[PDB]
Amino acid sequence: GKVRTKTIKRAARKIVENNYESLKPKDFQNNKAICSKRNVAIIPSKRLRNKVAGYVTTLMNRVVKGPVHGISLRLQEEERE
RNA sequence: GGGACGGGUGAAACAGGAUGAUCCCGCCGAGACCGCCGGCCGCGCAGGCGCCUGCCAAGACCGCCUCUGUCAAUCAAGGGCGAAGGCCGGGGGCUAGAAGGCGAUCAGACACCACCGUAUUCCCGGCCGUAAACGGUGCCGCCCCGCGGCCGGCGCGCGCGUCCCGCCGGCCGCCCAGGGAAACCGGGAGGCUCCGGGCUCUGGGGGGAGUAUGGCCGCAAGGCUGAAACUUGAAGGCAUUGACGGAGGGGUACCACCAGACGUGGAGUCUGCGGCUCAAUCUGACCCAACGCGCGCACCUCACCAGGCCCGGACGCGCGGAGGACCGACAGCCGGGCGCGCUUUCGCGAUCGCGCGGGCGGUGGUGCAUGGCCGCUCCCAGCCCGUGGCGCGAGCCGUCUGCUCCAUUGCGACAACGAGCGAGACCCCGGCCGCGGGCGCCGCGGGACGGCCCGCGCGAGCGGGAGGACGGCGGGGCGAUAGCAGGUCUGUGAUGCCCUCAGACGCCCUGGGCCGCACGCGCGCUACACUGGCGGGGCCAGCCGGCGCCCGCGAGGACGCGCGGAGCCCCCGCCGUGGCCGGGACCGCGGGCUGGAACGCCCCCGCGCACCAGGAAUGUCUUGUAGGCGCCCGCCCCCACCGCG
Ligand SMILES: CC[C@H]1CN2CCc3cc(OC)c(OC)cc3[C@@H]2C[C@@H]1C[C@H]1NCCc2cc(OC)c(OC)cc21
Numbered sequence: 001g002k003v004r005t006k007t008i009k010r011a012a013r014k015i016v017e018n019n020y021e022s023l024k025p026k027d028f029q030n031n032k033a034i035c036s037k038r039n040v041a042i043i044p045s046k047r048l049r050n051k052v053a054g055y056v057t058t059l060m061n062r063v064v065k066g067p068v069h070g071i072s073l074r075l076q077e078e079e080r081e
Numbered sequence: 082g083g084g085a086c087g088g089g090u091g092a093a094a095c096a097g098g099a100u101g102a103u104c105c106c107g108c109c110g111a112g113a114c115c116g117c118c119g120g121c122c123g124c125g126c127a128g129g130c131g132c133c134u135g136c137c138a139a140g141a142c143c144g145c146c147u148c149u150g151u152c153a154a155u156c157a158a159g160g161g162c163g164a165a166g167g168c169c170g171g172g173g174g175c176u177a178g179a180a181g182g183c184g185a186u187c188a189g190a191c192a193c194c195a196c197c198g199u200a201u202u203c204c205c206g207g208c209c210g211u212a213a214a215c216g217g218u219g220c221c222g223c224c225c226c227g228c229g230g231c232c233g234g235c236g237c238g239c240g241c242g243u244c245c246c247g248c249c250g251g252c253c254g255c256c257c258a259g260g261g262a263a264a265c266c267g268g269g270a271g272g273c274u275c276c277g278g279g280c281u282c283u284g285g286g287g288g289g290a291g292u293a294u295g296g297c298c299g300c301a302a303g304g305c306u307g308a309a310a311c312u313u314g315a316a317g318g319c320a321u322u323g324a325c326g327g328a329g330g331g332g333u334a335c336c337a338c339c340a341g342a343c344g345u346g347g348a349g350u351c352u353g354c355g356g357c358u359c360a361a362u363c364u365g366a367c368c369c370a371a372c373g374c375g376c377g378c379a380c381c382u383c384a385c386c387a388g389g390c391c392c393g394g395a396c397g398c399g400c401g402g403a404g405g406a407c408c409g410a411c412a413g414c415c416g417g418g419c420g421c422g423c424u425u426u427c428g429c430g431a432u433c434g435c436g437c438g439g440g441c442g443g444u445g446g447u448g449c450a451u452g453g454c455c456g457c458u459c460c461c462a463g464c465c466c467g468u469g470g471c472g473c474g475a476g477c478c479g480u481c482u483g484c485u486c487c488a489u490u491g492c493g494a495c496a497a498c499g500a501g502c503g504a505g506a507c508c509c510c511g512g513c514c515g516c517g518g519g520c521g522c523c524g525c526g527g528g529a530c531g532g533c534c535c536g537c538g539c540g541a542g543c544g545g546g547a548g549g550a551c552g553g554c555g556g557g558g559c560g561a562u563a564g565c566a567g568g569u570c571u572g573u574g575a576u577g578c579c580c581u582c583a584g585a586c587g588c589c590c591u592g593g594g595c596c597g598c599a600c601g602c603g604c605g606c607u608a609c610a611c612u613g614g615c616g617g618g619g620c621c622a623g624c625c626g627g628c629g630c631c632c633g634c635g636a637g638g639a640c641g642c643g644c645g646g647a648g649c650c651c652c653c654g655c656c657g658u659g660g661c662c663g664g665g666a667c668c669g670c671g672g673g674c675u676g677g678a679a680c681g682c683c684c685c686c687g688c689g690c691a692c693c694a695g696g697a698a699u700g701u702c703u704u705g706u707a708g709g710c711g712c713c714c715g716c717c718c719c720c721a722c723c724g725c726g
């Protein structure tokens with residue numbers, strides 16, 4: 001399914017922003033575990049967790065290949081010079 | 082010259098062609114016209130103005146230390162010009178073309194389309210004197226934010242280019258203020274309720290009516306001037322939201338189509354529906370959004386028809402009542418039958434009776450008085466809030482003239498910012514795996530997410546390929562705001578207002594009807610046969626589920642115990658294109674079941690209607706789908722061609 005409601009996008013974002021180092025760009029199992037983790041957030045369902053994780057993956061690689069709008073990745077370091 | 086069609090239309094048909102058409106070339110004649118350049122260019126009082134050459138007069142503007150000295154502005158009466166069409170008298174006669182004719186189209190078409198064609202269109206002389214003759218805005222005059230284009234003339238500066246800086250006049254575009262009902266104007270429609278520069282003309286709700294009667298002009302057609310009676314409560318202007326469009330641009334769906342399949346409409350029958358009938362054949366619903374639907378009519382159900390018992394009249398006031406209120410019965414008749422009623426004669430005892438008030442009940446009416454529940458708009462994707470801003474205001478922005486999505490699903494912008502519902506998310510079912518448990522396979526979890534590769538695309542996301550039980554909304558449920566005079570008072574101790582209320586529409590019994598049939602159609606069933614019918618045999622389902630022995634051909638029956646699954650299909654044979662062994666409607670004896678009671682339902686023998694694939698018309702459908710085959714439940718004393726599965 002190609003439906004991506006707002007909730008998925010906003011949640012996947014806040015999650016990537018608040019938690020990068022613990023993750024990888026193309027994985028789906030590590031990202032799924034990170035989402036399932038309690039500190040990061042809470043997902044009542046399973047299908048929701050899977051969808052959010054997938055969107056997290058696609059955002060993460062879209063970022064790692066190149067900086068992405070709306071993402072507070074903490075990248076001033078390389079440009080604050 | 083050459084040899085067969087040409088013309089014309091959406092498609093055709095009238096007219097032309099072996100008398101040589103259409104087609105190519107050349108020549109001849111006449112009369113109209115003045116193209117591409119041609120324009121937010123220009124000229125003219127307006128109407129209007131475009132070939133070469135030449136002639137005649139005229140005009141605004143610019144430049145000027147040239148002349149005069151108020152000679153000016155606007156205007157009834159009066160005068161002149163005045164598109165096209167039209168008229169009088171003469172010319173000329175190619176195009177087009179009122180009238181007229183003819184061919185199509187149409188229900189008709191004397192109209193739109195095709196073809197032929199008169200006046201007219203052209204010139205001279207003269208009448209007419211009207212146009213959305215529009216900038217729908219009178220003439221003269223002053224002030225007025227800013228930017229820009231073009232035309233003509235003049236001047237300034239320089240690095241001399243047809244440069245850039247200005248002046249006058251003219252034609253235009255945008256626009257700050259300001260104005261206005263607003264659209265809009267802004268080279269005023271500004272400087273005006275803070276309401277006075279000068280001159281002229283017109284109007285006073287809509288029709289009657291620019292009509293009648295007079296007058297003037299005109300050959301005429303007609304023009305200028307121009308009432309009343311009567312009638313009427315609105316007619317109009319600018320703008321807003323919806324609905325509609327034989328309007329445009331994007332999208333979408335087997336209740337749309339393409340490609341195909343299976344059908345219906347043809348016959349007989351089941352069932353419901355209108356009509357006809359009867360004593361009654363009780364009713365509701367009429368495009369999708371009524372017509373096997375309001376869950377199986379011998380009695381009840383049941384409302385309708387013909388007839389009969391009962392009060393089951395609560396509760397308060399007056400009266401009477403045990404010196405007897407009210408209620409039952411043997412026998413005999415009449416009555417379908419009953420002590421219903423009739424002829425006597427016995428019984429019981431205040432549980433009351435009569436009049437007045439007031440109840441209860443009713444498948445009685447109004448669904449256009451209502452609640453609730455359904456259907457439809459809607460097999461959609463849309464709907465609203467707070468702050469702020471634009472408008473006098475109804476209203477608008479937010480809520481998208483971009484790209485994607487099945488989807489107001491998302492990316493990216495924007496006088497908008499920030500939220501919510503709906504959508505998705507969610508719940509049930511199934512497919513693969515793990516753990517546990519177990520009379521009987523049933524409890525908890527995992528797993529799939531546009532995740533991986535490749536292309537593109539800023540992106541959202543699109544196309545392909547993999548591995549995987551399953552690959553991109555697998556099937557159902559729930560279902561936004563707003564609304565319909567949709568259906569239901571015949572579902573109810575849900576109901577407002579009317580009408581029934583002791584010879585009752587109350588309640589109970591006996592029969593009958595709802596099924597009656599010259600007729601039109603809606604959902605279905607069975608068949609038209611060899612891809613078949615008949616006989617014997619073998620054999621596998623799931624929602625789920627009860628069997629033995631003995632009689633009887635069978636249907637069924639008498640006993641006694643707890644135990645259990647089919648059609649198609651496959652195999653061997655008969656038939657052999659004949660309305661034949663296809664098809665089994667209709668009808669005639671008989672044996673049984675249900676039930677108080679067959680009109681209902683099964684079995685046996687016999688008889689053996691149409692029907693040879695069904696016209697105009699029309700329905701449904703994309704994987705375990707269509708179609709074919711059968712099996713269980715609902716209602717039900719018996720009964721499924723129905724419906725949910
Ligand atoms: C009801 C009269 C109309 C129908 N007819 C005959 C059938 C026909 C068939 C056509 O091709 C499909 C056709 O082309 C469009 C025209 C016709 C005529 C046309 C009649 C109507 C006519 N006037 C109104 C609209 C119209 C539009 C047309 O389209 C341009 C047209 O074609 C020339 C003719 C017409």
Ligand SMILES: [Mg+2]
Nearest residue numbers: 165166167202
């Ligand atoms: Mg003329």
Ligand SMILES: [Mg+2]
Nearest residue numbers: 213214215217
């Ligand atoms: Mg005028």
Ligand SMILES: [Mg+2]
Nearest residue numbers: 273274276277
């Ligand atoms: Mg005034």
Ligand SMILES: [Mg+2]
Nearest residue numbers: 283284285286
């Ligand atoms: Mg007035």
Ligand SMILES: [Mg+2]
Nearest residue numbers: 285286287288
């Ligand atoms: Mg008037």
